[PDB]
Amino acid sequence: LVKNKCVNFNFNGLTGTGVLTESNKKFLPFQQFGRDIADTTDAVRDPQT
Amino acid sequence: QKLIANQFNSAIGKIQDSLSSTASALGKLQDVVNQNAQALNTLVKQLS
């Protein structure tokens, strides 16, 4: 895992391109995916950590 | 001259108060910004 740079990430089969950084969104234990107003993924929990 | 000056200054003061107040006479500009904003939101939401 790498942060702060453009990378072709793949999380649990979900693919996307972007810059990954720590997020302050306090996801509840059941929550796994955050979405913006455009229904596009903007936050996620890594399965290994 | 002096009376006209006083009236002019008082008018300017009342304009300042009216704009300073909660009045929203600026609605026309707000419409221009708001309409474009919601149009953008609609276009973005269409991707889903």
Ligand SMILES: *[C@@H]1O[C@H](CO)[C@@H](O)[C@H](O)[C@H]1NC(C)=O
């Ligand atoms: C495996 O994944 C779990 C859950 O993210 C994590 O706690 C653990 O450190 C990972 N590695 C090993 C060797 O279990």
